[PDB]
């Protein structure tokens, strides 16, 4: 009676006066929790209770959503004025911690815009998630593990520190609740790149001063240190590795400056091949004298493994030593290239090095009238180095997607391919369903 | 259980094989109809019956809207090609005229 | 009749509310007198055709874009007010909402 009496009453826009059918429903949830749980019934820990509390808690977002969206509205101001936000309450979050996995929120989260709707009693979800922080403490902390109980509870851990970002917390609860997110979590039942992702998560409504940032920085230590050995590696499913870590704390003060790593990175000699690798990971950070001392050891001097160290942030700037180098690299490849072009082979690297070259040069990262000279190889590069000219019927709409941010921004300052790659992005959203190619377009061209 | 699933695969892309969920949707449906219709009892009436009618009818048109222009990837074109859009025949035309109000057909035509 | 109704503090919403339709074609420079600009305020759409320059675009209503025809639509785009607020408008919309048409002004003109 929600799904249409109610949900296409509301396209029908009619008000209902006394009691409408969302208090019914929710009252109604609420008399069945009392009952089952102050009788102490077990029947409280089966599917079909949770399965009718999802759909009861999912259809109501729904319903709120479309009232927020529908229109403006005249009828509405006299009987409800200043709207009365619906609040979700301690006992709204304590039923979709308990009862909702993570794919139920990310669904909602999709549907119902749920980051424009309002919390209130800030202080017992703060309590709340202490203790959860607290308990999964005290079960990770021990040699015995409750299997029967961990099952149990590692579902409403996780919901409720991912439902976690829409609620302000204080920071000394917050100290908590980050250390045990951090440190204590299992690994099997969440890996060290979804870490990142609930931190990053955490870190949206609020900010974490100096303690947290603390806090983080011994993380790094500890994640440091484990790195000795030469077999112990990270895995992740979610992209993001270690490295978005330190991101966060450069995003956070910019000028951190590690204290305990600087004096692990100190003392490195040689003969790791593992640690120095996770190491170079943090480039940015680590202070300036060991930065350099340290750095200078193990560079990478011949062009092919230059691309690679390029490739993955070692390498930024271009010496005009290292200018000579990559000059070489490429007119290597263009005597290879005019050999082939004479056979009629085509050869292209595995690692689309000229492509790498056109991205960073359309970024101007690379100085010479050769490049000019260079006109005529690869379509991505004629069309970084000279749009003006470049033969837009040979582009490939795909490459948009290899873009990050800041290329996005300058590809859209560039002045001839505005147009055409406005045509192309109509064509590509009149033909294809492709959701990226639409946000690329509205968020950037548009 | 079966529309959410049906509507987060509508956002991440993911591809349906044999038995998907529109199938058992339309069986169902069509069961439950029958049954009541055959057997001749005059719950076909009530209301529920014409809501339980209204949102099936109205996932298994959604779903036939992405179907129509749902990227079709190397997979989908070696096991989906020609594209075969959800047919809408007789029963379902007598199903949406007996079960719908104005307002619910005009809303998907905007959907 | 309507600075008594300012004092009455009644709007009456006519169907035959013409005036917006004046506007509409003084909007298309049918009209040339300058009285229309005596008559500021008195309904927004008529406020948002005539001086476009000082309208707060704060109390436009998206609905309104379903009414017009190809030649208003753009006029509408033609004027050096109006393109980046409607732009705005429109992107908010199309995010917010499920309906194709205001994908398809925001394709066909605006861009």
């Known amino acids: 009676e929600l799904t249409n009496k109610v949900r296409s009453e ?21 008399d069945n929790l009392r009952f089952l749980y102050e009788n102490c019934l077990w029947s409280v820990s089966f599917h079909e209770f949770h399965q009718y509390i999802r759909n009861s808690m999912s259809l109501l977002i729904e319903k709120a959503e479309y009232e927020r969206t529908r229109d403006i509205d005249e009828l509405g101001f006299s009987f409800f004025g200043k709207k009365s936000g619906f609040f979700m309450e301690y006992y709204d979050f304590v039923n979709i911690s308990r009862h909702f996995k993570i794919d139920d929120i990310k669904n909602l989260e999709r549907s119902c815009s749920i980051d424009k709707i309002r919390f209130g009693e800030q202080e017992k979800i703060e309590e709340y998630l202490v203790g959860i922080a607290e308990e999964i403490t005290k079960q990770f ?13 590692i579902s409403e851990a996780k919901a409720a520190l991912y439902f976690a970002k829409y609620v302000k917390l204080s920071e000394e609860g917050l100290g908590k609740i980050v250390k045990a997110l951090l440190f204590y979590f299992p690994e099997r039942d969440l890996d060290i790149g979804k870490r990142y992702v609930w931190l990053e998560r955490l870190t949206k409504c609020n900010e974490l001063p100096k303690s947290i940032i603390s806090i983080i920085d011994d993380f790094l230590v500890l994640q440091a240190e484990k790195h000795i050995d030469q077999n112990y590696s990270e895995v992740s499913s979610n992209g993001l590795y270690s490295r978005d870590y330190g991101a966060l704390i450069k995003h956070f003060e910019k000028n951190f400056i ?53 490739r993955i942030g070692l390498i930024d700037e271009f010496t005009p030593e290292h200018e000579e180098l990559i000059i070489e690299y490429l007119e290597t490849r263009k005597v290879n290239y005019i050999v082939e072009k004479e056979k009629g082979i085509q050869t292209f690297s595995s690692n689309d090095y000229m492509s790498t070259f056109g991205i960073w040069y359309f970024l101007e990262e690379i100085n010479n009238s050769k490049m000019e000279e260079f006109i005529g190889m690869d379509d991505q590069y004629d069309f970084f180095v000279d749009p003006e000219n470049f033969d837009y019927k040979k582009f490939i709409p795909s490459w948009l997607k290899n873009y990050n941010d800041k290329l996005l921004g300058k590809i859209a300052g560039n002045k001839h391919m505005k147009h055409h790659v406005i045509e192309v992005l109509k064509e590509r959203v009149k033909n294809s369903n492709d959701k990226r190619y639409l946000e690329i377009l509205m968020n950037y061209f548009i």
Do not use: W
């Open 141 to 153: 902390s021990a040699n015995g593990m409750n299997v029967v109980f961990y099952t149990q509870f």
């Open 258 to 310: 590690s204290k305990r790593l600087s004096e692990i990175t100190l003392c490195l000699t040689q003969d790791k091949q593992k640690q120095i690798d996770f190491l170079f990971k943090l480039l940015p950070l680590l202070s300036t004298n060991a930065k350099s001392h340290l750095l200078s050891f193990k560079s990478v001097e011949n062009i092919n493994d230059l691309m690679n160290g390029i």
């Open 10 to 30: 509301m396209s029908e826009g009619s008000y209902s006066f006394g009691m409408s059918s969302d208090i019914v429903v929710l009252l109604r949830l609420y």
